[PDB]
Amino acid sequence: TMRGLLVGRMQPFHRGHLQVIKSILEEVDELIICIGSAQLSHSIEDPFTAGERVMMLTKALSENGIPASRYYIIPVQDIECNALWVGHIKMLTPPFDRVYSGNPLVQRLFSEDGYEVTAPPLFYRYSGTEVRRRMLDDGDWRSLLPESVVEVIDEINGVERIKHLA
Amino acid sequence: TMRGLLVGRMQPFHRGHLQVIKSILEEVDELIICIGSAQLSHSIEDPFTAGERVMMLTKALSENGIPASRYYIIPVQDIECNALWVGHIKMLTPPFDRVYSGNPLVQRLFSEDGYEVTAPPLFYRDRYSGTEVRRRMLDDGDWRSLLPESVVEVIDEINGVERIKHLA
Amino acid sequence: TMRGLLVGRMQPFHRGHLQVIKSILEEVDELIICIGSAQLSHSIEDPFTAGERVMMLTKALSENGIPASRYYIIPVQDIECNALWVGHIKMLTPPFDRVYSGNPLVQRLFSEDGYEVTAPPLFYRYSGTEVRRRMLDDGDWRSLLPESVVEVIDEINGVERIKHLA
Amino acid sequence: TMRGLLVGRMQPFHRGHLQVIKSILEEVDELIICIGSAQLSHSIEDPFTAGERVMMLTKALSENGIPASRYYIIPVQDIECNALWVGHIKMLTPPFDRVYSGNPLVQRLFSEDGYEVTAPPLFYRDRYSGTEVRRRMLDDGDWRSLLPESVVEVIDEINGVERIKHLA
Amino acid sequence: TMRGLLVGRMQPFHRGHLQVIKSILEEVDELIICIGSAQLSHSIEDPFTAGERVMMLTKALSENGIPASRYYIIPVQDIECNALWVGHIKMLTPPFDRVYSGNPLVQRLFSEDGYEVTAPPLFYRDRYSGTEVRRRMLDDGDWRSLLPESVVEVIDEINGVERIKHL
Amino acid sequence: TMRGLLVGRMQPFHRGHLQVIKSILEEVDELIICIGSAQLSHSIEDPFTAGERVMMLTKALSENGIPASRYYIIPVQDIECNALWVGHIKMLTPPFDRVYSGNPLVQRLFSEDGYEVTAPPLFYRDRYSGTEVRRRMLDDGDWRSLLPESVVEVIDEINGVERIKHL
Numbered sequence A, C: 001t002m003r004g005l006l007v008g009r010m011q012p013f014h015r016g017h018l019q020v021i022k023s024i025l026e027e028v029d030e031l032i033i034c035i036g037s038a039q040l041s042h043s044i045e046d047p048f049t050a051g052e053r054v055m056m057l058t059k060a061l062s063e064n065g066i067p068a069s070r071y072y073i074i075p076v077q078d079i080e081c082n083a084l085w086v087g088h089i090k091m092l093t094p095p096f097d098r099v100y101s102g103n104p105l106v107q108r109l110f111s112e113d114g115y116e117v118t119a120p121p122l123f124y125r126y127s128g129t130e131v132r133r134r135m136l137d138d139g140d141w142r143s144l145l146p147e148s149v150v151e152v153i154d155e156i157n158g159v160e161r162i163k164h165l166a
Numbered sequence B, D: 001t002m003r004g005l006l007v008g009r010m011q012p013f014h015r016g017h018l019q020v021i022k023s024i025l026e027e028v029d030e031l032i033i034c035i036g037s038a039q040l041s042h043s044i045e046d047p048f049t050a051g052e053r054v055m056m057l058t059k060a061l062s063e064n065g066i067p068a069s070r071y072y073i074i075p076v077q078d079i080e081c082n083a084l085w086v087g088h089i090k091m092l093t094p095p096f097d098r099v100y101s102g103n104p105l106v107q108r109l110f111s112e113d114g115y116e117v118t119a120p121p122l123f124y125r126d127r128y129s130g131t132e133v134r135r136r137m138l139d140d141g142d143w144r145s146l147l148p149e150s151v152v153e154v155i156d157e158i159n160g161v162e163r164i165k166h167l168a
Numbered sequence E, F: 001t002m003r004g005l006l007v008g009r010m011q012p013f014h015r016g017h018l019q020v021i022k023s024i025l026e027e028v029d030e031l032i033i034c035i036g037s038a039q040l041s042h043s044i045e046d047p048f049t050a051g052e053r054v055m056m057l058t059k060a061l062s063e064n065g066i067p068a069s070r071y072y073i074i075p076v077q078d079i080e081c082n083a084l085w086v087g088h089i090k091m092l093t094p095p096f097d098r099v100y101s102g103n104p105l106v107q108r109l110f111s112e113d114g115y116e117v118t119a120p121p122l123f124y125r126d127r128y129s130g131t132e133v134r135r136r137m138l139d140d141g142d143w144r145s146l147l148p149e150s151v152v153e154v155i156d157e158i159n160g161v162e163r164i165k166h167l
Ligand SMILES: NC(=O)c1ccc[n+]([C@@H]2O[C@H](COP(=O)([O-])OP(=O)(O)OC[C@H]3O[C@@H](n4cnc5c(N)ncnc54)[C@H](OP(=O)(O)O)[C@@H]3O)[C@@H](O)[C@H]2O)c1
Pocket: A007, A008, A009, A010, A011, A016, A020, A035, A036, A037, A038, A077, A078, A079, A080, A081, A082, A085, A101, A102, A103, A105, A106, A120, A122, A123, A124, A126, A127, A128, A129
């Protein structure tokens, strides 16, 4: 009955995002997780495709004890009109009641559309910038990710990709 | 890890689709399920949104004891260029090895891109199809019996029947 | 304070549409008039451009005693996602309270978004099909339109266009 | 019938734009006013929607005794191809004879398409510009005095100040 | 320098299109050839991609001794606004003076933009048309005889007959 | 038949690009030349339209005795998804075997799709580059000497220098 929504680039999905997700799941029955900027891939800032991130999330949420009945994973391309983005999200998702975001634009867009909006319950070393930097510089990127996500990154040759792009 | 792909409108997701899915899951480790024509909603032929169909699939696959580790559910908008549609799918999905489709165009597009392609292991009859489901929703027939219960619950929540009747 | 919305192709704007508009203006303070399928032009069914129809409406509503403070005229291209069309309209228009339409799809889309929806107060010989047929067959198309709209059609060579296209 | 064209973001519509418009109306019979970058809203640089700006213009031009027969107000989304933007404008507008712009790109695009192009008859200073208006909305300065009253009423109704402050 | 323009789907490029092109080249210095509906491929009506048709035209025009200095080959996707299509063409092509088309819509769109418009100098019969070519590809008829040999070679390389049969 | 691919903005087409093209033509039977960022025109960085650049390439390659049977010229608009760009190119071009690029992104995108990728055989200096050409157009320098004469003629016809100065 009570459904939350979370949106992030997740480039890549790391232990931080997972902690936040589990924390949100203590307050809602179900969580809709949107992969934002689904159109961006193959850059230093945004290395992975939508599909690759769907894979990461799907595998990570399965490998941790979260029942499938409690979440949805949805890629969302950015669009040119901010005034349409909430409609875009709504079309691509189940009905939802509350939005979790610390981003002022996301907050205000959802808020103007009449949604309840609140900051994530947790703020997280576990950041995507650090993960990507470590992938580039042969640091310990693996320890920042769930093992299921490292397996995705090995399969898709994520490290080699990001190094070539740099 | 052997990964299949299936693509369909699923307007709505019915017991036929589910039967096909379970059959495919006997021959692959994981199945990527794409919801095609994700852009189309609010017509007699295509009543439900991408999001509504994501919900239907997610609930149905969960209610039937298929482990979450064995599937992916991905909305896919149609595009103008057929020659690009396979690239579009690939961008939106995990890597995959084999495509299941009875549709000649889908087959040929994937085959030209070097994918293994086969027909679905099962073919369901017209009486269990989306057309029959939608017709029964319109005419007060027994649409519920053609769907998994978890999907009927989605349709009740979103007022699907009222929608389709108004649109007609 | 109370604002209505009306949407139509208006190919072209005829006396019928004007009658409906004046009738709606007895029930609302302001009327937002959307020119639908703004992208379609240069066919038998849809001969005129968005701009040409903006012109027709702007001139017709000015030539009749309707104060400028009581209406807005807005071209609206169709989009691929029905579930986004109401958001599309909202982005392009002032805030509004009630929608006037006899079209089941328009009704249901607006209704699902929480808007009050009602049929036009008047139903109208004055139809666009008749107007276009008369333009093609040298009938009396002029008598079906406000004079300000006929002047637009003369300036843009509307009759010659539609005849060449046929 | 001599018809001018003007194009601007008008984020928001201020007394400067209005002054320019009235000056242009001394030398043309009718003025087509295009709201550029109609797609951009909900940023510090571009806070208001196309619709909100249509409202602002419609109300402001009405409140200043400019007859409705003398202008057109048209939202125009930007497009990726500069070489097509003039065609895009032409499709969305009545026929026109002369373009008023101080912007080199706008000038050149219209000039290459064979239109007469001239600079606006008036140039307003920075202190009356959209940047100053938005800055004052953010910093609790006197933004109201830079706008026609009809535009301030739009901004109150849509909670423009609260929006821009939250976005910052 | 007098420059003509021609626009067609060319699904595929056949001897008829070539005949028309050569006739136009008697009356202009250079001919801009646009491949219309460049977005459509992999249907019975529109089997070949933009790229495949570029290949067909490029090969056919080179095999028939038409100097390269006399033509341009340009893929053009359809767009949703008819009132923008001429601007779309203009952006994608060299400057041009005259448009060759028998199609009322194409004629009127170009004409409203101030271009001189005229019908093609030659009309080929249905028996030599793309519809006949495609039908023969499907039904194992003599499709090859309706195409320049360079185009047949393209169709063999890209497995065009196998494609259209599967579809 | 061994077919190479090259992709560049070519704003405008200069002697450097031509030198590279001729070097590539020693190693392949045919070269597909894509005009990238075909959507961008009327800026200081990207002054010329797709059509104008098609004209430049078509004229330059014909003026230098490269037979028409050895190349294809294809405008290619950028797209928002990098993961789709190779599919976009493939749709718009003949089949090809090898990609020539020094750009890491272009290399990796093509490489991930299974194409052989190699750097161009020749690198020209900054002094002969598009940036230098455009700068000289702006500052009344000797831009003409950096271009094939056929390209200069295009630029005169389309009033390219006047455009870039106004911008
Ligand atoms: N018109 C449109 O298309 C439109 C409009 C609005 C938003 N969007 C999209 O919506 C998405 C969401 O916006 P966003 O700004 O939140 O995306 P984002 O790129 O994920 O930005 C969030 C930033 O804050 C960090 N962060 C997020 N949650 C955190 C937490 N609980 N604790 C600590 N740090 C946290 C992230 O770190 P990590 O990188 O490590 O995760 C990231 O650096 C974006 O893709 C944006 O493009 C699109």
